[PDB]
Structures are given as C-alpha cells and as structure tokens.
Coordinates of C-alpha atoms and ligand atoms in Angstrom, one line a residue:
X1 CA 149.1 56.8 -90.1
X2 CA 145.6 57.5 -87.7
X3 CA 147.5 60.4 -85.3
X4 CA 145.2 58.4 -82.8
X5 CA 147.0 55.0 -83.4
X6 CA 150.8 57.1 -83.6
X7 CA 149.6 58.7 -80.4
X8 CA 149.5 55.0 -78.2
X9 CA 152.6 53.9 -79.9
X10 CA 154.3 56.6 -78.8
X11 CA 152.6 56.5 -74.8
X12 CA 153.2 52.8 -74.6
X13 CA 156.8 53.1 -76.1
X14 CA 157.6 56.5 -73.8
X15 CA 159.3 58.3 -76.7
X16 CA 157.9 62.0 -76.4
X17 CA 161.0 63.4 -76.0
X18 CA 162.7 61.9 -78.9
X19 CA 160.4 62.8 -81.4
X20 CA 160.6 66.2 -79.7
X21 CA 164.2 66.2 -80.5
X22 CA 163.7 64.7 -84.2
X23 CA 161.6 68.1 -84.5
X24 CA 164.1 70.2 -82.8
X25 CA 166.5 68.8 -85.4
X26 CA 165.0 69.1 -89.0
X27 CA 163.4 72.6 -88.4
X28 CA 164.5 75.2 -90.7
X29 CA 167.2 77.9 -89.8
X30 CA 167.0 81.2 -91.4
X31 CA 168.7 84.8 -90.5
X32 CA 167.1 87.5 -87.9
X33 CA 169.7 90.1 -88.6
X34 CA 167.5 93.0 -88.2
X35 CA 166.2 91.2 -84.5
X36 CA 169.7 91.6 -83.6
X37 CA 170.5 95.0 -84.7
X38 CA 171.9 96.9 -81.7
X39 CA 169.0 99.7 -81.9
X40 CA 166.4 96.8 -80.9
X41 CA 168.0 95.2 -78.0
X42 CA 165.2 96.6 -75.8
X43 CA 162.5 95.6 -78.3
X44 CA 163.3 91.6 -77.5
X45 CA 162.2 89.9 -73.9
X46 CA 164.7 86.9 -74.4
X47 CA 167.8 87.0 -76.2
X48 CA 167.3 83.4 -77.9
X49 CA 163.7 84.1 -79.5
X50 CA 164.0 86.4 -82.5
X51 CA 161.8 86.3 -85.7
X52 CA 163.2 85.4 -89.1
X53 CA 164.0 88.7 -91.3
X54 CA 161.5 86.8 -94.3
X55 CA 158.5 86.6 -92.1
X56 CA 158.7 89.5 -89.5
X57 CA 156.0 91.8 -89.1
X58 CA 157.3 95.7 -90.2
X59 CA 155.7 98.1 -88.7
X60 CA 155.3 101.7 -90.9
X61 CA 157.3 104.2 -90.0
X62 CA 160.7 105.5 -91.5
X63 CA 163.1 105.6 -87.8
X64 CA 162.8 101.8 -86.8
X65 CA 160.5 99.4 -88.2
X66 CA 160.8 96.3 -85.6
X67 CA 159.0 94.2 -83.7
X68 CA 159.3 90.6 -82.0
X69 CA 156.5 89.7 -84.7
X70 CA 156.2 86.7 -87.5
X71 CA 153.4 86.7 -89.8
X72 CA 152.5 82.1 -90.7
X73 CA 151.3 82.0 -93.5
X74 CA 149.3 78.5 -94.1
X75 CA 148.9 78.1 -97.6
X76 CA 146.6 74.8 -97.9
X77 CA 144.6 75.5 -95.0
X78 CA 144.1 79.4 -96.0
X79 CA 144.8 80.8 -93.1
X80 CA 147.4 83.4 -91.5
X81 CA 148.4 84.0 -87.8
X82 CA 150.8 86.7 -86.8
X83 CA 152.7 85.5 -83.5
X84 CA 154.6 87.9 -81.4
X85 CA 156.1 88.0 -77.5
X86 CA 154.2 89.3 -75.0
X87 CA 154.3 93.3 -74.7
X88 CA 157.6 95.6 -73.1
X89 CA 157.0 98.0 -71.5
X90 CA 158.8 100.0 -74.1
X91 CA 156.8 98.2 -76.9
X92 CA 153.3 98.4 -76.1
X93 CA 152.9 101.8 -78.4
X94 CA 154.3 99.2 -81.6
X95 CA 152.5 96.4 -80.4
X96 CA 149.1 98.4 -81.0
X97 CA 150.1 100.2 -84.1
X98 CA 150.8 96.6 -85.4
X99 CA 147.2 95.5 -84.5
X100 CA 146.4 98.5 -86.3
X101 CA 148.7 98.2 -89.7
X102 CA 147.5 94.8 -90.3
X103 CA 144.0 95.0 -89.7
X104 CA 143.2 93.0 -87.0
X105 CA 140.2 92.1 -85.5
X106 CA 141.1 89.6 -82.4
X107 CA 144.5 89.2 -79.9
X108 CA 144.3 86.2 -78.4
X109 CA 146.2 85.9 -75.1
X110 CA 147.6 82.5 -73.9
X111 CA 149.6 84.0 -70.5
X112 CA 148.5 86.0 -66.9
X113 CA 150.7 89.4 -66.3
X114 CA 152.2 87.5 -63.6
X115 CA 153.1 83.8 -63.5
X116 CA 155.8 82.1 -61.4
X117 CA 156.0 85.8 -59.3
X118 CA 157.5 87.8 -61.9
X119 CA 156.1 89.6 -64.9
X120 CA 155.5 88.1 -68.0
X121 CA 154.5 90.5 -70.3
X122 CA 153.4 94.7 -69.2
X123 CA 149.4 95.4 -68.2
X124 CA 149.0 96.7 -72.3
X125 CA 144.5 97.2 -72.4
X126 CA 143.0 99.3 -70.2
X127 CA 141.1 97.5 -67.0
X128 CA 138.1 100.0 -66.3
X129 CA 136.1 102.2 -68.6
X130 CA 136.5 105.5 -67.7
X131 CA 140.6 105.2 -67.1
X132 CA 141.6 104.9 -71.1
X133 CA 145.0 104.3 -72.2
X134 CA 147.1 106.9 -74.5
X135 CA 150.0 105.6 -76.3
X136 CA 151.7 109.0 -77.1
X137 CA 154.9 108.1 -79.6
X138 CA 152.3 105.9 -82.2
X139 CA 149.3 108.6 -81.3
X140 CA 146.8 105.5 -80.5
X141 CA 143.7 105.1 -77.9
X142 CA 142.3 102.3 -76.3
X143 CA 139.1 102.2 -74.3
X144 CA 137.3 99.0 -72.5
X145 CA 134.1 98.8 -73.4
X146 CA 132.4 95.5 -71.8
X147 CA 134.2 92.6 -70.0
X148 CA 133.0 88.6 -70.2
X149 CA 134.6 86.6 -67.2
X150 CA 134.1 82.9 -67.4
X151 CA 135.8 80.4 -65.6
X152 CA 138.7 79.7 -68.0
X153 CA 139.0 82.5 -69.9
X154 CA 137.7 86.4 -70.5
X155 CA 136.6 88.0 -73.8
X156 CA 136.9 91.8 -73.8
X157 CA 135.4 94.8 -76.2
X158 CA 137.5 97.8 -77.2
X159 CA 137.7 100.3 -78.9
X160 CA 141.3 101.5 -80.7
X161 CA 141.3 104.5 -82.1
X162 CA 144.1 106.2 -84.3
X163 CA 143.9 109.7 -83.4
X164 CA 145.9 110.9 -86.5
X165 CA 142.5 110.2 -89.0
X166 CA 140.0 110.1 -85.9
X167 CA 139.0 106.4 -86.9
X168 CA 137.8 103.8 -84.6
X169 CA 137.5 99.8 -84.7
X170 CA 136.1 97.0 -82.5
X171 CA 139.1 95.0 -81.0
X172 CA 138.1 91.5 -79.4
X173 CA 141.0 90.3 -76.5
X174 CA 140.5 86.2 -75.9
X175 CA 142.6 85.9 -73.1
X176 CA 142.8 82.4 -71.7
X177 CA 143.4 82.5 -67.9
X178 CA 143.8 78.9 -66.6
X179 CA 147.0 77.5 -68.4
X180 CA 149.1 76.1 -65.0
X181 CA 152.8 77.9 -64.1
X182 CA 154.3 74.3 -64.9
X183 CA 153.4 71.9 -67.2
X184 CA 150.0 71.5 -70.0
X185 CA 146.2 71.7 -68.7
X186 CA 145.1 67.8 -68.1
X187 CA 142.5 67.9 -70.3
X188 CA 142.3 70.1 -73.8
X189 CA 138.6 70.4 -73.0
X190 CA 138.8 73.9 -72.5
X191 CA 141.6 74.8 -74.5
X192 CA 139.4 73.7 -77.6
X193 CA 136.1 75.5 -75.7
X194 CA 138.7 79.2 -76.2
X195 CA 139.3 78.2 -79.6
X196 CA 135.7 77.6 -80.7
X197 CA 135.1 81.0 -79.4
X198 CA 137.8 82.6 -80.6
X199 CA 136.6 81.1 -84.6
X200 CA 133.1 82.1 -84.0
X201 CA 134.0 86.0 -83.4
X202 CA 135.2 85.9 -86.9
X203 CA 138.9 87.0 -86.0
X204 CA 140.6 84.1 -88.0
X205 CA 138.5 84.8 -91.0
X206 CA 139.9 86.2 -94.5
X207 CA 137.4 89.0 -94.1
X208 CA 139.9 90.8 -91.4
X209 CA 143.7 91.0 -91.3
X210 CA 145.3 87.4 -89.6
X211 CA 145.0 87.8 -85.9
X212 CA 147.4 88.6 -83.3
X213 CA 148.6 85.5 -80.6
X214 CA 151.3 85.5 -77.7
X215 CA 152.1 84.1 -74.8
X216 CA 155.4 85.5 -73.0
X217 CA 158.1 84.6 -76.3
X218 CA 155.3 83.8 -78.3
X219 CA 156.0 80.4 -79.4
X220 CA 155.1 78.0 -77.0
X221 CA 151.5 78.1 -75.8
X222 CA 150.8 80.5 -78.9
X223 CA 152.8 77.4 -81.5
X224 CA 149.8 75.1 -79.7
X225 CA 147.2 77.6 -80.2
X226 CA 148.0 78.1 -84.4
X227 CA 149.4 74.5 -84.7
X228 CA 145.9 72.9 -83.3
X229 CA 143.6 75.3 -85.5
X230 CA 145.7 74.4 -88.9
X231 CA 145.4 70.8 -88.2
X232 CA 141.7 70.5 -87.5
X233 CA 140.7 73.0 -90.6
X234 CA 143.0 70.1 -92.8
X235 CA 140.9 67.4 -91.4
X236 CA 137.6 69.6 -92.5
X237 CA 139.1 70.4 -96.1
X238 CA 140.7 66.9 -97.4
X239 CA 139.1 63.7 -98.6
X240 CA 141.5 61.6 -96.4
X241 CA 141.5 63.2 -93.0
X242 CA 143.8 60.6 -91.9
X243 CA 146.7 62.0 -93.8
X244 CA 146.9 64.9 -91.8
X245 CA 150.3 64.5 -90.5
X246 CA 150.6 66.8 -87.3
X247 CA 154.7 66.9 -87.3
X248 CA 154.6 67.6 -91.2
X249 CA 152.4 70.9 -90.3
X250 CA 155.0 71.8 -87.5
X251 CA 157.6 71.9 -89.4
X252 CA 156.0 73.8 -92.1
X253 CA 155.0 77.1 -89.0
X254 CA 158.4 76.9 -88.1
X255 CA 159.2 77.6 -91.5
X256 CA 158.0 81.1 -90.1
X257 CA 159.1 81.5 -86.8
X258 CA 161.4 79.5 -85.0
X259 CA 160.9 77.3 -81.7
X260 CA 157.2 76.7 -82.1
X261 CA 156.2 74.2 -79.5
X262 CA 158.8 74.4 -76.7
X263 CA 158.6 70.8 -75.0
X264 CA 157.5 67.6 -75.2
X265 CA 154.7 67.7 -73.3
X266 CA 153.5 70.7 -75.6
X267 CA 154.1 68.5 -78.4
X268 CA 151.9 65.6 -76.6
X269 CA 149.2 67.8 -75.7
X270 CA 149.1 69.6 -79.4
X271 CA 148.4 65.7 -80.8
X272 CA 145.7 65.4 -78.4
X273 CA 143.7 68.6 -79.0
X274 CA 143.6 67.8 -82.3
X275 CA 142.5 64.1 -81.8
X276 CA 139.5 65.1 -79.5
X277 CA 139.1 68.3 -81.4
X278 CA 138.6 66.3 -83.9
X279 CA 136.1 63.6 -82.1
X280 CA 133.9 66.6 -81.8
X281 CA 134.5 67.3 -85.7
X282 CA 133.9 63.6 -87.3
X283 CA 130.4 64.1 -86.1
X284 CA 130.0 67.7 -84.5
Ligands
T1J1 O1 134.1 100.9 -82.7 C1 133.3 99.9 -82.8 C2 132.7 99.6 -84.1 C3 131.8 98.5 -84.3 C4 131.5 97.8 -83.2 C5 132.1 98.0 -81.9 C6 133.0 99.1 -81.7 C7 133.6 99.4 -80.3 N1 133.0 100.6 -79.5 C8 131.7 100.6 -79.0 N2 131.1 101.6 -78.3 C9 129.8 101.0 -78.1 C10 128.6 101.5 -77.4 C11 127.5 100.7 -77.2 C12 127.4 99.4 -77.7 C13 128.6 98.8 -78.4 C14 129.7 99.6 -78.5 N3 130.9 99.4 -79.1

C-alpha cells in the first residue's frame, strides 16, 4: 500500500499511537547480558537502553571490551550504521577508539550538550584549534581543524590521531543543531537537507567503515536518522517503490538494537521524511 495513501488513513482515523504500540509489541527481544554486567554500570546513561550481546560493538582490548554500541546491519539496502548513546564522561576515551576500530569516516550528531537544562551527553571534540583534546587511557588525539555553521546544523574537520602507530585520519562531525527540547521539527525540510549532506561526504559509503550516530540513548532521533536513509535507498534500488513497507524496515533495525523510534510522533514524522524525501527522489 502507497505509504502516502497509509499516511492519511492513519491522520484522518487519529491512530498514531496504536500503530506505535503494534510496533512496540512485535519487536524482537534478545539478551544484553554483557550491558548488564556489574563492571559497566558506569558505561550506560539510562538503565533501560542496553544493546543486544549479538549486535554490540566490542571494542579491542583484553580488560573490558564494552560500549553502549550496536552495529544495523541492512542487508537489501547494503548499508551498516553503528548507533550508540551519547558520550560519559567516563566513556569518551572508548567512544573514540571505537570510531577508530571500525574505521569511520563521519559521527553524525542528532542532540545539543545541553537540552531541557541538563546535560545530555559530555563536550567529547575539541571547540578551538590550538586547545586539542588527549584521551590518555585509549592513547588518542583529536584536533579541530575548520568549523561550518549554517543555520540548522554544523559540519566540522578533525583530525584523530592514534598516538601508538603515529597515524592520522580526517574525521567529519554532522551535528544537527535545531531538533526542538519537545516534540519533532514541523517540517522534515531540513532534516532531509543534513542527510543529503551527510551522503555526499561519503561517510555512509562501503568504501569506509559504517558511520557512527547518537543522540542522548541513541535510538530515538538516531532510529529516525538510519530508518529514513534505509527506506529512501529501497525506493532507489527496487522495481516497485511502492512496496517499501516503512514498519516492515523498523522492525527489521530493531532486530539490532532495541527501542528504535521512541514515540508516535517520531514514528509519524519518519513516514513523512521519507514520503517528501522521496518527492525530491521520483524526479530529483
Ligand atoms: O588527516 C587528514 C587526512 C586527509 C584529509 C584531512 C585530514 C585532517 N587534517 C588536516 N590538516 C589540514 C591542513 C590543511 C588543509 C586540510 C587539512 N586537514
């Protein structure tokens, strides 16, 4: 069924919340043991957001390999996104030596430091040139090297370098700025705009390792982000774009980490990304 035509049904009809809930329901349930271990308590920002022990990210190193991290895997569409929470304060050493490990090439960044008056994940790249950041216990540096502010989001150059082997690599940081304390944007205008950008850098390409998203738990904003992308490369790639059923992809991501998409109104503006995304698609 036309997402388009499934869209109005469900606006006319007011059910949002119950489809939400028919999600919610039918998602897969799988063990995060090792999330739970006491040794990581400080390595998780909420208690109730852990990732799966068959999909999480391990870093490489013999004393404790974990991190809040889930590598989705897309099979059809050929593409892999790792999600993970925003960065601890304890965790923003791991959180780098992952980018590092899986050969990244882009973090894209869906939340600001502070929302709502408290912090929602630690200040993690450097914010001048000349003041670099160290991370001592995974021997990393990180060094700003330009800065592009636009009016709904900022795209950064740095440089990581592991100082074990004395290698360097460009790391590009898409951080969208404007998502509201409460609610969805009105528009998914400039949400699209970010992701556009974020696919021409080549971060999302096979060529590098899958790029890194979060948010503050990393599956709300961040399911939106991945969830939006999959869809709109399915209606590129198949004969019948029309059968790309968006719930059907849902529940295949949170065969990977659980939660993705947190409300209803996430879930309502995911369906109409991808239905505008796609009216710049058909013929753009
Ligand atoms: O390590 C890298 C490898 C390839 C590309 C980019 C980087 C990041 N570092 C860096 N220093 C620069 C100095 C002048 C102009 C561009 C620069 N990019």
């Amino acid at each position: 069924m036309e997402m388009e035509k499934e869209f109005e049904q469900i606006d006319k009809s007011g059910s949002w919340a119950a489809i939400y809930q028919d999600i919610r329901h039918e998602a897969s349930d799988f063990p995060s043991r090792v999330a739970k271990l006491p040794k990581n308590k400080n390595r998780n920002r909420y208690r109730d957001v852990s990732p799966f022990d068959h999909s999480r990210i391990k870093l490489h190193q013999e004393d404790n390999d974990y991190i809040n991290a889930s590598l989705i895997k897309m099979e059809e569409a050929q593409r892999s996104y790792i999600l993970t929470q925003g960065p601890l304060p304890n965790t923003v050493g791991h959180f780098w030596e992952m980018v590092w490990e899986q050969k990244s090439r882009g973090v894209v960044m869906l939340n600001r430091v502070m929302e709502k008056g408290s912090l929602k994940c630690a200040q993690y790249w450097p914010q001048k040139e000349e003041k670099e950041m160290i991370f001592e216990d995974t021997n990393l540096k990180l060094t700003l090297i330009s800065e592009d502010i636009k009016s709904y989001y900022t795209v950064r150059q740095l440089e990581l370098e592991n100082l074990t082997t004395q290698e360097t690599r460009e790391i590009l940081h898409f951080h969208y700025t404007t998502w509201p304390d409460f609610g969805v944007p009105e528009s998914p205008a400039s949400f699209l705009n970010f992701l556009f950008k974020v696919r021409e850098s080549g971060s999302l390409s096979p060529e590098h390792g899958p790029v890194v998203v979060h948010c503050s738990a990393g599956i709300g904003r961040s399911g939106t982000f991945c969830l939006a992308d999959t869809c709109l490369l399915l209606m590129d790639k198949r004969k019948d774009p029309s059968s790309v059923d968006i719930k059907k992809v849902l529940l295949e991501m949170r065969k990977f980490r659980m939660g993705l998409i947190q409300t209803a109104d996430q879930l309502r503006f995911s369906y109409l990304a991808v239905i505008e995304g796609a009216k710049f698609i058909m013929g753009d």
